[PDB]
Design a binder for this molecule. Structure first.
Ligand SMILES: [Mg+2]
Ligand SMILES: [Zn+2]
Ligand SMILES: [Zn+2]
Ligand SMILES: [Zn+2]
Lengths: 93, 168, 521, 88, 48, 84, 250, 58, 171
RNA sequence: UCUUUUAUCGAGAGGU
């Protein structure tokens, strides 16, 4: 699904079809992130229902996200080169 | 899960160390501070509740809830039944008996009297309305926050809170 | 709905924040230490508590639940490690910036040379965006030849009154030259990373602002490497070769070599030290840390593999047409696709297509069981996955999947409200239809399906003008929708009749071609 | 083990000519011994997943070193239809 | 924007890549077709 | 806070094609998972056909919230946008 | 020699250090070493004794044996480690030499351990790291690990369980203390598949096939004649058996 | 074009990126604000006061 | 400490329950959830002020799911402990390791080491109590204590106090 | 009642 077909489905305007073609019908993934530090380094456990972000001692302010796996791999390598991307869920001007 | 009104307080370059709770030094954490905000963002003060206004206002809201659920048609435990679930049944039950057997006042009229008396920090404002004291040393030993204020007039506050205090 | 249930409120990304990493941060987020170069335990399977496979890391086996988090191999995102160092080293991607900063400031007491008493400086303090700010600053502080121990009655800014050397670059090393005082002899020593660390660890915060950085995200002494992260083996997979042989992805061998060089750098400066044996091995460690993030370092030969091929440094997984940002995010690979050869047919209507029987019985469509269609889905579930018209998988609500192939006795199925049915592709579904390479926005159009035998697609010939297509052996592609929203968007936006007039030139595109034209004349 | 039927092999592991083979029919069963019951691992060689042919000729001889060495030759017939290409 | 970039990017892929014409005259030089468009979208500070 | 009242609304009163598309899609997605349908259901069973049949007679209960460029917005009812 | 004009000058003050002749020289009886060669490569061993000359050391090793099971070794194909069992050797395949000492296949085993000589250069004496495995080798709530919530004894093991308190035991302080219970924080599928078939009804009558899949009532026969597998009812098939083509009574 | 050096220039400069273009919101898998996506669909209530009272949310 | 906290809860409503009585079911689930729970950020939320007039507003139909998002804005009479807070209590249980004292919504444990040496646990007395001269602490006695410890189990909090000081004892 | 495996790097020959 080349970049040019992406440009065409932008030319038509079907944003939902694109959000589909680049998610469900390929590689969806889920990541639990913190809200103070802003990194994908949350230690989570589900059938016990408990979370922990040891970099800030935070067991309350955590949010889950739906991203492709390739973005997870990308950001893990960028962190592996000491360049940190931080993701926040609310604007602040 | 259930939030409130306060956000922001964002992390900076430092970590503040005056963050622990101490009710003897007026440290109530970042939740019951001095200046709060309502459901719209307007600047509000803190509303601390002492015993008398506590019981009276609980009776008010829960009686308007009883008559309200009755379409428009009095006791502690029966009024705690208007709620839902069992947590408010037990907890609100022992809360109504608790705040019931210590009522320094049982009327909204003398509640208006002391409401004229009190109005000063809202916590210690509701604490002057809270603990019934004898002399001044009790008022400063129970509340060590009235030290560095230099504004007494507390003896007649005790003579009015005690002179008006209805008998139990 | 693929995912197990959690309890964290669902949101979305709004603002992305970039910034350098600090060492103590890496010491905090990491959950294990790296020490031992050998990969295996001691030939007894598993790993070596301390090696580059410690099961605290990434667990990619059928049964080993990730000991750190506890999940399987489908929920663990991996966990970072951290390797120590016995010496700080440069970062190959920042050298010219460290050069400029080692020019702008003092070389002792650590203070910004020019001050706001200079009108050019006094107006250079003000700019908003940092890059043009530091352009305006470095435009000036490249010529201040003394850390004035005074201000321009004597006022002392706090400077040390020392002269200033000149810094230059060769390969991966910075040279410092002191032209002493008309001209007395220069001395060109080597600014080792430890010195520059000690110097940058003194800059006041307001100069960390004036230099264009930020006190809580870009701190200059963070640019010089001290501790090192170790990515989880979800990033470094190990292939299985002839089933009984397995090599290691490059980053494993490279991290192992860096650790070898670390254990080498320890010993020499702990006892017998012939001086010219210390700086050489340390320079080798700098070389490893350099070729861990860049292979085409202009200036020095590429670090080869064991078999003599250049190593895939991290810098190359990303850039390029076949890396990450061109190859797995802008244009990834999709499902529910179809590729086959075209063929002409003059007995269709303008927006139809002819799907073979096999492509129809392979592709599918999820449908919701309601009250208006339960009968048709009873017939479809009865007709099985090997006869048209029939259905395939049946999906219940929690996440299970009944497969009507292996499920011998399927006559006992009763359909509850809310389930889904992956039926076949049938008549009148709107499918997207595409040819490479697409140029103007008319090369992707949604047609209506029509099932036909044989092995080729079908087109009405009047749609051979936007596709630039002809039946002399070409191929095209069919994409299938899934949910209802996207079907609505296809039928209401990407149809054929709504594309007859082109916005390129205010004139149509589809007309009469070939025999129909000659014989209508 | 792999999935396709193993019932078309004779006893030494080589399918005989004259047998019809279709989708993923195993034609050469070969085993690799496990490095030290249930002590061997399969290393077969299946027919391609998109072919339907009659086995034609099987060859069995030795290699260079001194071990066995097998080849198989399948064949099939093809007929023109809607889609095949032609040229003058 | 995309519709404009395409509606200009499409008549380009079918235009002379050397054009010639006035080719039999050395006193008259002119750049047309591709090379000219490339010398336009680049703002080349030296034309032909 | 940033909303515009029901007298100062200055955006065009015509249902554009993108809006129509998302209305039909979402309403169909609701009609599918057993939701009350607000017309006389007769000889069509496809949810998209039912949604268009509703949009023809104007019974769809939804609210368009057009975000203006700088941060404000406007709220239009789907039963006063003049369907072309 | 590298042709580049790379020679460098040494300072006079650096000369003697260039000629320093030399204290690892370690290895003591009773200590552990790691073997560097053979099937025991990587294994921990105790130094039992050294040769008079001073070259090879006798090591006490957990054996890796098969008791001659497949006789008529390499490191890659070595056996698991397990103490020598002389009765197993007696049963399966042995010379008694002393109390608890047997020579088995020309190696000596004393109280279950191999004693074998190795060159000192074939053992590692420095920086050995014992493994997890080597460390292993060389009233309901009562017993569970609880971690104080508002006390001062971290964790501890619940020794007693009352109604208002719980006698917990510390790990570092090793002292039994009572704490509130709530205060403590608990921390084939058918017989005709693949069998040859003849079809007796339908458009495929007289054609050979094989039952590829017979889930139920509707079978899938792989026709021999064209490369296609068809759906056919099981009533339409004859199966081959001991005597001729039998119907579905086989 | 020129990726890693731009990511360094932004990494050591604390450039806050803010999510408004199409490329960003697509390469994270979200609804890109374009055509279909420039508004929202709030569930109604005034016209819910038109349903028969029986369909109610119990 | 008791307060009047302004809380807003996000109720994500399902499309099927879009009946003619939305706001009613909204208040139903709201007051099924919030009323009584413990939050380490705001303790035990007791009772909401004014429950039948809460402006729930309108809901953003979450793009891609079909559900609704409601931002309920209410006001309650919450409680929250703090370290060093002097509060009253009514005990509920006595034990050789300390006594339990209900401070309204919760129960506070007081260990023996935080009890003056004069108060001696008397199992023989019926009912059992902590006894001394001119002093008596039995089940149901008014106790004046000081909150010196708070633990957050996310679900519920657990406080500890003492009465080995001045003006803390039996009143 | 499911499920069910296709290395890797590189080179070349091709089709629109
Ligand atoms: Mg062609
Ligand atoms: Zn954090
Ligand atoms: Zn993990
Ligand atoms: Zn200086």
């Amino acid at each position: 699904f080349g970049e040019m077909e992406r440009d065409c489905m932008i030319a038509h305007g079907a944003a939902g079809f694109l959000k589909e073609r680049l998610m469900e019908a390929s590689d969806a993934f889920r990541v639990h992130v913190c809200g103070i530090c802003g990194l994908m380094s949350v230690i989570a456990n589900l059938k016990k229902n408990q979370f922990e972000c040891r970099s800030c001692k935070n067991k309350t302010n955590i949010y889950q996200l739906h991203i492709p796996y390739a973005a997870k791999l990308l950001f893990q390598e960028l962190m592996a080169m000491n360049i940190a991307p931080r993701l926040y869920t609310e604007r602040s001007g | 899960v259930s939030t409130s009104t306060v956000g922001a307080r964002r992390r900076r370059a430092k970590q503040q160390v005056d963050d622990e709770e101490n009710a003897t030094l007026l440290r109530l954490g970042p939740e019951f501070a001095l200046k709060q905000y309502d459901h719209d963002g307007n600047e509000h003060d803190l509303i601390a509740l002492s015993l008398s206004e506590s019981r009276l206002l609980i009776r008010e809201a829960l009686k308007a809830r009883s008559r309200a659920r009755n379409g428009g048609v009095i006791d502690d435990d029966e009024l705690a039944k208007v709620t839902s679930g069992a947590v408010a049944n037990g907890v609100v039950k022992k809360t109504l008996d608790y705040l019931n057997t210590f009522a320094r006042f049982k009327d909204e009229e003398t509640c208006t009297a002391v409401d004229q008396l009190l109005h000063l920090h809202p916590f210690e404002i509701a604490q002057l309305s809270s603990l019934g004291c004898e002399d001044v040393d009790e008022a400063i030993t129970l509340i060590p926050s009235l030290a560095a204020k230099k504004e007494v007039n507390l003896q007649r506050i005790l003579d009015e809170l005690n002179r008006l205090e209805d008998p139990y | 709905s693929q995912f197990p249930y959690s309890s964290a409120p669902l949101r979305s990304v709004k603002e992305v924040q970039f910034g350098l990493l600090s060492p103590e941060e890496i010491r905090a987020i990491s959950v294990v230490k790296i020490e031992y170069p050998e990969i295996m335990d001691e030939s007894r399977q598993r790993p070596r508590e301390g090696g580059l496979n410690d099961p605290k890391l990434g667990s990619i086996d059928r049964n080993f639940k990730c000991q750190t988090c506890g999940e399987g191999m489908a929920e663990c995102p991996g966990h970072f490690g951290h390797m120590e160092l016995a010496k700080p080293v440069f970062h190959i991607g920042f050298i010219p910036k460290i050069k400029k900063v080692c020019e702008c400031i003092c070389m002792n007491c650590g203070k910004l040379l020019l001050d706001e008493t200079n009108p050019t400086m006094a107006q250079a303090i003000r700019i908003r965006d940092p890059k043009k700010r530091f352009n305006a600053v470095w435009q000036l502080c490249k010529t201040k030849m003394v850390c004035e121990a005074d201000a321009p009655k004597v006022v002392s800014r706090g400077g040390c009154g020392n002269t200033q050397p000149v810094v230059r670059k060769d390969g991966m090393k910075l040279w410092g030259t002191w032209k002493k005082s008309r001209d007395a002899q220069p001395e060109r020593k080597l600014l080792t990373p430890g010195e520059i660390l000690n110097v940058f660890k003194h800059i006041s915060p307001e100069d960390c602002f004036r230099l264009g950085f930020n006190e809580d995200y870009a701190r200059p002494e963070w640019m010089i490497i001290t501790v090192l992260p170790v990515p989880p083996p979800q990033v470094r997979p190990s292939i299985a070769m002839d089933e009984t042989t397995q090599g290691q992805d490059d980053l494993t061998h490279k991290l192992s070599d860096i650790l070898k060089a670390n254990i080498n750098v320890q010993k020499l400066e702990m006892d017998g030290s012939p001086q010219h044996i210390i700086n050489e091995v340390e320079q080798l460690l700098q070389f490893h840390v350099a070729t861990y993030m860049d292979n085409d370092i202009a200036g020095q030969p590429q670090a080869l593999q064991k078999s003599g091929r250049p190593v895939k440094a991290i810098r190359a997984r990303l850039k390029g047409k076949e890396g990450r940002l061109r190859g797995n995010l802008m244009g990834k690979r999709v499902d529910f696709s179809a590729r086959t050869v075209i063929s002409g047919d003059p007995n269709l209507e303008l927006d139809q297509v002819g799907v073979p029987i096999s492509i129809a019985k392979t592709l599918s469509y999820p449908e919701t069981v309601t009250q208006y269609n339960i009968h048709r889905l009873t017939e479809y579930v009865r007709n099985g996955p090997n006869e048209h018209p029939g259905a395939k998988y049946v999906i219940r609500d929690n996440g299970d999947r009944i497969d009507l192939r292996y499920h011998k006795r399927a006559g006992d199925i009763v359909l509850q409200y809310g389930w889904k049915v992956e039926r076949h592709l049938m008549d009148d579904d709107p499918v997207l239809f595409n040819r490479q390479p697409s140029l103007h926005k008319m090369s992707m159009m949604a047609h209506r399906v029509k099932v036909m035998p044989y092995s080729t697609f079908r087109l009405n010939l009047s749609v051979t003008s936007p596709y630039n297509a002809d039946f002399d052996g070409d191929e095209m592609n069919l994409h299938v929708p899934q949910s209802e929203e996207t079907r609505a968007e296809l039928s209401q936006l990407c149809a054929v009749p709504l594309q007859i007039v082109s916005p390129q030139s205010n004139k149509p595109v589809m007309g009469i071609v070939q025999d129909t034209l000659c014989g209508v004349r | 083990l792999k999935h396709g039927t193993y019932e078309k092999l004779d006893e030494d592991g080589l399918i005989a000519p004259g047998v019809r083979v279709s989708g993923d029919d195993i034609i050469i069963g070969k085993t690799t011994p496990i490095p030290p019951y249930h002590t061997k691992r399969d290393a077969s060689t299946p027919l391609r997943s998109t072919e339907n042919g009659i086995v034609d000729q099987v060859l069995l001889t030795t290699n260079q070193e001194g071990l066995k060495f097998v080849k198989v030759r399948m064949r099939t017939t093809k007929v023109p239809q809607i889609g095949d290409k032609f040229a003058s | 924007g995309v519709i404009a970039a395409q509606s200009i990017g499409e008549p380009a892929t079918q235009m002379t890549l050397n054009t010639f014409h006035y080719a039999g005259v050395s006193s008259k030089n002119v750049t047309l077709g591709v090379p000219r468009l490339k010398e336009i979208l680049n703002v080349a500070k030296n034309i032909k | 806070e940033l909303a515009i009242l029901k007298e100062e609304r200055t955006t065009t009163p015509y249902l554009t094609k993108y809006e129509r598309a998302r209305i039909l899609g979402t309403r169909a997605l609701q009609i599918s998972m057993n939701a009350p349908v607000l017309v006389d259901i007769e000889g069509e069973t496809d949810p998209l056909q039912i949604a268009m049949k509703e949009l023809s007679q104007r019974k769809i209960p939804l609210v368009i919230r057009r975000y203006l460029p700088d941060g404000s917005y406007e709220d239009w009812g789907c039963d006063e946008l003049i369907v072309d | 020699v590298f042709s580049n004009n790379s020679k460098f000058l040494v300072g006079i003050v650096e000369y003697k250090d260039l000629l320093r002749p030399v204290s690892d020289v370690k290895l003591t009886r009773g200590s552990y070493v790691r073997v560097k060669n053979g099937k025991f490569k990587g294994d921990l061993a105790q130094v039992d004794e050294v040769l008079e000359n001073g070259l090879e050391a006798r090591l006490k090793l957990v054996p890796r044996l098969d008791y001659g099971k497949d006789l008529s070794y390499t490191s890659k194909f070595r056996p698991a480690q397990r103490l020598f069992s002389e009765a197993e050797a007696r049963v399966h395949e042995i010379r008694r030499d002393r109390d608890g000492f047997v020579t088995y296949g020309g190696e000596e085993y004393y109280e279950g351990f191999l004693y074998k000589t190795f060159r000192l250069q074939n053992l590692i004496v420095n920086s050995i790291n014992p493994t997890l495995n080597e460390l292993s080798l060389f009233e309901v709530k009562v017993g569970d690990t609880v971690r104080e919530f508002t006390g001062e004894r971290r964790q501890g093991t619940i020794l007693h369980v009352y109604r208002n308190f719980l006698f917990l035991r510390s790990r570092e302080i090793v002292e039994n203390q009572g704490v509130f219970v709530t205060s403590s924080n608990r921390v084939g599928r058918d017989p005709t598949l693949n069998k040859t078939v003849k079809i007796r009804q339908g458009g495929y009558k007289g054609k050979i096939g094989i039952v590829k899949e017979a889930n139920g009532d509707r079978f899938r026969v792989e026709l021999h004649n064209p490369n296609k597998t068809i759906p056919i009812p099981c009533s339409f098939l004859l199966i081959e058996s001991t005597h001729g083509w039998v119907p579905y009574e086989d | 074009e020129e990726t890693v050096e731009i990511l360094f220039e932004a990494g050591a400069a604390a450039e806050l990126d803010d999510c408004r273009g199409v490329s960003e919101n697509v390469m994270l898998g979200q609804l890109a604000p374009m055509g279909t996506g420039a508004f929202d669909v709030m569930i109604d209530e005034k016209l819910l006061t038109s349903l028969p009272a029986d369909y109610a949310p119990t | 400490m008791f307060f009047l906290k302004d809380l807003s809860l996000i109720l994500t409503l399902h499309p099927s329950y879009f009946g003619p009585q939305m706001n009613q079911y909204l208040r139903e689930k709201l007051l099924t959830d919030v009323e009584g729970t413990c939050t380490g950020q705001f303790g035990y939320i007791v009772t909401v002020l004014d429950g039948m007039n809460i402006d729930v507003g309108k809901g953003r139909i979450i793009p891609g799911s079909g559900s609704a998002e409601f931002e309920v804005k209410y006001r309650a009479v919450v409680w929250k402990p703090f370290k060093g807070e002097v509060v009253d209590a009514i005990v509920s249980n006595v034990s050789p390791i300390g006594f339990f004292a209900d401070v309204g919504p919760l129960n506070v444990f007081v260990s023996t080491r935080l009890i003056p040496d004069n108060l001696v646990y008397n199992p023989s007395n019926s009912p059992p109590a902590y006894m001394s001269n001119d002093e008596l602490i039995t089940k149901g006695s008014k106790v004046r204590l000081k909150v010196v410890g708070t633990r957050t189990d996310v679900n519920e909090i657990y406080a500890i106090g003492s009465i080995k000081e001045d003006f803390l004892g039996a009143i």
